[PDB]
Design an enzyme around this catalytic site. Structure first.
Site, mmCIF file in Angstrom:
data_model
loop_
_atom_site.group_PDB
_atom_site.id
_atom_site.type_symbol
_atom_site.label_atom_id
_atom_site.label_comp_id
_atom_site.label_asym_id
_atom_site.label_seq_id
_atom_site.Cartn_x
_atom_site.Cartn_y
_atom_site.Cartn_z
ATOM 1 N N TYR B 16 46.725 23.897 29.084
ATOM 2 C CA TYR B 16 45.810 25.042 29.342
ATOM 3 C C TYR B 16 46.860 25.993 30.173
ATOM 4 O O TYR B 16 47.342 27.420 29.365
ATOM 5 C CB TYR B 16 44.411 25.391 29.791
ATOM 6 C CG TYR B 16 43.651 26.690 30.143
ATOM 7 C CD1 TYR B 16 43.191 27.439 29.190
ATOM 8 C CD2 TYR B 16 44.066 27.785 31.650
ATOM 9 C CE1 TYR B 16 42.796 28.071 29.244
ATOM 10 C CE2 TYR B 16 43.816 28.639 31.901
ATOM 11 C CZ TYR B 16 42.149 29.174 30.131
ATOM 12 O OH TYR B 16 42.555 30.618 30.274
ATOM 13 N N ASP B 40 36.372 36.839 34.288
ATOM 14 C CA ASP B 40 38.353 36.894 34.763
ATOM 15 C C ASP B 40 38.957 38.134 35.111
ATOM 16 O O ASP B 40 38.800 39.378 33.731
ATOM 17 C CB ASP B 40 38.855 36.994 33.740
ATOM 18 C CG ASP B 40 40.500 36.894 34.288
ATOM 19 O OD1 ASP B 40 40.458 37.509 34.361
ATOM 20 O OD2 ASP B 40 41.293 35.123 33.448
ATOM 21 N N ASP B 100 48.248 35.166 42.428
ATOM 22 C CA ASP B 100 47.332 33.909 42.715
ATOM 23 C C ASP B 100 46.197 34.073 42.148
ATOM 24 O O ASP B 100 45.301 34.519 41.941
ATOM 25 C CB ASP B 100 47.227 33.660 44.210
ATOM 26 C CG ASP B 100 48.962 33.375 44.811
ATOM 27 O OD1 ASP B 100 49.260 32.465 44.082
ATOM 28 O OD2 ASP B 100 49.099 34.473 45.441
ATOM 29 N N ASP B 103 41.051 28.497 38.747
ATOM 30 C CA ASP B 103 40.373 28.646 37.085
ATOM 31 C C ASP B 103 39.088 27.131 38.230
ATOM 32 O O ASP B 103 39.932 26.381 38.110
ATOM 33 C CB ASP B 103 40.894 29.257 35.890
ATOM 34 C CG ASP B 103 41.371 30.331 35.986
ATOM 35 O OD1 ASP B 103 41.584 31.268 36.111
ATOM 36 O OD2 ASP B 103 42.359 29.819 34.632
#
Ligand code: CL
Ligand code: CL
Ligand code: MG
Ligand code: MG
Lengths: 126, 128
Positions: B16, B40, B100, B103
């Site tokens: 990913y 997100d 930074d 996930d």
């Protein structure tokens, strides 16, 4: 809710309290109403006797060290995740376990939920 | 693939990251579940589904010039979830910055991302 800048500082302090092995100071940072899913995917642990039997079983003795291995990420909704490592013993020897915890902080600044991602795949004998 | 093991996760998640770095959007979006959600950042409302997720990865990435790399190991559970640390390098206001990020994801029994949460803020930016 803790400001992101603040969620950061509650999370770096935590690695502090874990590392010095201060189990008691680790168990005040939590809420009445908290769960420890550690490792995530296990039922969760809740109740202040219970959890406190969790940090005692894992940091009693002293011989566990834990340090942030990058900066705390935090959100603006009182959450936050951080990367760290732990040096401890497995199969009698020096190992290390790579970890990310994610923490949700209630309106009183206590760990409402903590979730801890690792498994074997995150163990290195040394 | 079925519900990924811890080992396979780690692998799914490093890839990913590479897609990301190269900016292959169709590719990013076919890792997702047809009905997956993205947060997100975390703290802003989900988005639901491949069409919208695609609209969102174009908006971030489509500018080109974003790179990405892991900055530690993927952490993986036994219930189809992993978490990873990484850093996003881009351009912005003409200067280089970087962001930074961690996930947090879950997968399916078909090996596709059901859910993703992206922990970061404006506290995680750093315009050297
Ligand atoms: Cl990091
Ligand atoms: Cl790391
Ligand atoms: Mg690459
Ligand atoms: Mg499905």
């Amino acid at each position: 809710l803790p400001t992101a800048q603040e969620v950061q500082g509650l999370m770096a302090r935590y690695i502090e309290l874990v590392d010095v092995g201060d189990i008691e100071a680790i168990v005040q940072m939590y809420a009445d109403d908290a769960t420890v899913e550690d490792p995530f995917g296990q039922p969760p642990i809740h109740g202040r006797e219970q959890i406190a039997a969790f940090f005692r079983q894992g940091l009693g003795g002293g011989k566990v060290r834990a340090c942030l291995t990058g900066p705390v990420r935090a959100s603006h909704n009182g959450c936050g995740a951080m990367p760290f490592r732990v040096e401890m013993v497995w199969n009698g020897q020096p190992c290390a376990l790579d970890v990310i915890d994610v923490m949700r902080f209630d309106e009183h600044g206590r760990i409402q939920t903590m979730q801890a991602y690792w498994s074997e795949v995150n163990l290195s004998v040394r």
